[PDB]
Design a binder for this molecule. Structure first.
Ligand SMILES: *[C@H]1O[C@H](CO)[C@H](O)[C@H](O)[C@H]1NC(C)=O
Length: 165
């Protein structure tokens, strides 16, 4: 079930919310924003459904882990954080169990190497980065910014999700 469920309506909703949930100064770290350079060239592959289970799940996953801690709620509004991370929790759980299960279609570890690799590198460098900075007020900011950019990009592969007339 690797369909544009949260990419159609969740795109704007998540975008706006996630945008108002992050309160910081863009000038707080101009020498940190640049990071997590995800190779959209090789990672750009949303034409496959059973192949998006890894990339998709991985994305919402890394977010759940980070939002699964108190550090996240301690960095930004708790209310927004709760409802936010909450939606993703049930999202990944359902979405994943949707494609993951044999009810639909599965993927092979052959192509999953790249997908899993890219996604892994992103989340890895993300958590690792902020982890080295001691979850400082600057790290969280950088991670967030990239999260939005990468998110929008990953979702903007075909640009045919849902005609927003
Ligand atoms: C998807 O992966 C599973 C892994 O066990 C099976 O190999 C399955 O054969 C693959 N694709 C389908 C649904 O035929």
């Amino acid at each position: 079930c690797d369909l544009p469920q949260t990419h159609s309506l969740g795109s704007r909703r998540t975008l706006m919310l996630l945008a108002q949930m992050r309160k910081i100064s863009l000038f707080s770290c101009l020498k940190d924003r640049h990071d997590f350079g995800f190779p959209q060239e090789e990672f750009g592959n949303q034409f496959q459904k059973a192949e998006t289970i890894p990339v998709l799940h991985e994305m919402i996953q890394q977010i759940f882990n980070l939002f699964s801690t108190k550090d996240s709620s301690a960095a930004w509004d708790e209310t927004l954080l709760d409802k936010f991370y909450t939606e993703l929790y049930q999202q990944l759980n359902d979405l994943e169990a949707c494609v993951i299960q044999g009810v639909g279609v599965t993927e092979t570890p052959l192509m999953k190497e790249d997908s899993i690799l890219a996604v892994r590198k992103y989340f890895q460098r993300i958590t690792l980065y902020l982890k080295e900075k001691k979850y400082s007020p600057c790290a969280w900011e950088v991670v967030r910014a990239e999260i939005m950019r990468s998110f929008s990009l990953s979702t903007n592969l075909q640009e045919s999700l849902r005609s927003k007339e």
